[PDB]
């Protein structure tokens, strides 16, 4: 049992220069560990087999080093098809731990989210439910805290969030704030606020609507 730690937890580097990564071992794995290229929704493709030597079908640019505690993975010719989570794997000690994840993002000028909210349908009120979802579209980077409030008094334990992968063209992100309430708790209150907070937003953007307003 050896914990394998990766020092860049996330990474955002524009298509261009080197993007050297890190994988630190808790013991001396001693030039016996590997590297991977798990794209989202794919099988983890092998990059490097034992700390170097560029395993069998890698294009030109994924050399690494090691021997034997803190290893590197150099992406010298970044090539924007390579935007995937990278994993380091020790192998010559059991059990066989992996790294943590090295999500190489895309690096652009920080985009503001389009903070937009929607009431539940009247069809859902005929079912007995109330799902209030605030959609935040086209933002960069990821980090947004969204606060729901009962007419100004904050909401917990009903909020669900769905983050996207980074988009291919504008390199932004999208997010729902899925808040589900009952039919009774819907009809008790009116002003349903979506307090969004992004780094581009100097003030916390609060998007709201009253019940039966539209």
């Amino acid at each position: 049992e050896i914990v394998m730690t990766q020092s860049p937890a996330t990474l955002s580097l524009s298509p261009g220069e080197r993007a050297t990564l890190s994988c630190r071992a808790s013991q001396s794995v001693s030039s016996y560990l590997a590297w991977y290229q798990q794209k989202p929704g794919q099988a983890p493709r092998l990059l490097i087999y034992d700390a170097s030597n560029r395993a069998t079908g890698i294009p030109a640019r994924f050399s690494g080093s090691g021997s034997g505690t803190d290893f590197t993975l150099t992406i010298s010719s970044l090539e924007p098809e390579d935007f995937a989570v990278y994993y380091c794997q020790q192998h010559s000690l059991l059990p066989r731990t992996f790294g943590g994840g090295t999500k190489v993002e895309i690096k652009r000028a920080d985009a503001a989210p389009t903070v937009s909210i929607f009431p539940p349908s009247s069809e859902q009120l005929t079912s007995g439910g109330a799902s209030v979802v605030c959609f935040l579209n086209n933002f960069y980077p990821k980090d947004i805290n969204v606060k729901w409030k009962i007419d100004g008094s904050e909401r917990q334990n009903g909020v669900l969030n769905s983050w996207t992968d980074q988009d291919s063209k504008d390199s932004t992100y999208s997010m729902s704030s899925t808040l589900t309430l009952t039919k009774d708790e819907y009809e008790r209150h009116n002003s349903y606020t979506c307090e969004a907070t992004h780094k581009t937003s100097t003030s916390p953007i609060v998007k709201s609507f009253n019940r039966n307003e539209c």
Binding site: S65, S92, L94
Partner: protein, 317 residues
């Protein structure tokens, strides 16, 4: 005494075999108290410490042979240390590690005694060449760098420029063969090496096997015996925490009998305890059985007979 005058050489080396973890070879065999269990009976134990094995960064492999330079430098450093402890008139107890160290552990022994005989107790022959291997691991190729008859069938592997072939084909005895390659069996039948595989051990019994072994090596002339003992040659019910275990091996009784008959010649002059891997026991109890087995094998090499031993004074006083 002449025997049981031990110089222990640790050698925590792993870059011949794939299963990383035999670097805790000397660490676990010493923390089980091999030194203290030797020091009851009259053993002038002198610990020469573990060797510092460097990490060559650009260890570019051969065709199939992998990590060649690290194993070559490790065995050269070990052969220097073994020649040092045999100039002190001791018995070169080397304990690793893996069988890749036995190149240096027999070469440094042959720098002092050029007429030694190797009892290679192993499940495997370890006689693969760099041309006939399939794994390419150097724990499967220590013998083929040492035999004089294989000069010319060995390419110049980097890091092994110092290796002089030191023993002949009729001066080595295998005991416990049960997993032999086709290339290994072809070399073993071409050179005519006297081998006692598990067929012959089941046929003759370990008494007749050890009697024919000592008559084959020591029958013509008394000469130093270098027992190079592997812990997968014993059955994996007794040593499961080894690198490449092969079932149907020598029992713990038969292993202790081999080492006792080697001791009672009084001509033991080097011991190798390789392939102990404490990171592969599925329980710590498996590691405990493996290490207690290897320690008991070493103690029975250096005088501890199962019938008992007494110091030569009167005890009824």
């Amino acid at each position: 005494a002449k025997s049981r005058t031990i110089g222990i050489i640790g050698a925590p080396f792993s870059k011949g075999q794939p299963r990383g973890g035999v670097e805790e070879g000397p660490t676990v065999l010493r923390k089980a108290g091999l030194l203290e269990k030797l020091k009851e009976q009259e053993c002038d134990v002198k610990d020469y410490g573990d060797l510092p094995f460097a990490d060559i960064p650009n260890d570019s492999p051969f065709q199939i042979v992998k990590n060649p330079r690290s194993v070559g430098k490790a065995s050269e450093q070990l052969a220097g240390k073994v020649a040092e402890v045999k100039k002190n008139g001791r018995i070169s107890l080397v304990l690793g590690g893996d069988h890749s160290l036995a190149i240096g552990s027999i070469s440094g022994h042959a720098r002092v005694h050029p007429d030694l005989g190797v009892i290679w107790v192993d499940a495997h022959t370890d006689i693969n060449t760099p041309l006939t291997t399939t794994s390419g691991n150097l724990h499967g190729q220590p013998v083929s760098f040492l035999l004089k008859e294989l000069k010319g069938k060995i390419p110049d592997v980097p890091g092994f420029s110092w290796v002089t072939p030191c023993i002949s084909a009729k001066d080595i005895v295998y005991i416990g063969l049960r997993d032999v390659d086709p290339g290994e069996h072809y070399i073993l039948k071409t050179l005519g090496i006297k081998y006692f595989s598990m067929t012959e051990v089941d046929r003759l019994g370990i008494g007749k096997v050890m009697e024919e072994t000592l008559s084959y090596l020591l029958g013509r002339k008394k000469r130093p015996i270098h027992l190079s003992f592997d812990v997968d040659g014993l059955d994996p019910s007794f040593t499961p925490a080894t690198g490449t275990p092969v079932v149907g091996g020598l029992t713990y009784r038969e292993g202790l009998y081999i080492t006792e008959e080697i001791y009672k010649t009084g001509l033991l002059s080097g011991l190798d305890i390789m392939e102990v891997n404490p990171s592969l026991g599925k329980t710590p109890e498996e590691v405990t059985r493996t290490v207690n087995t290897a320690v008991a094998i070493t103690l029975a090499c250096f005088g501890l007979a199962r019938e008992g031993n007494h110091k030569p004074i009167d005890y009824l006083n």
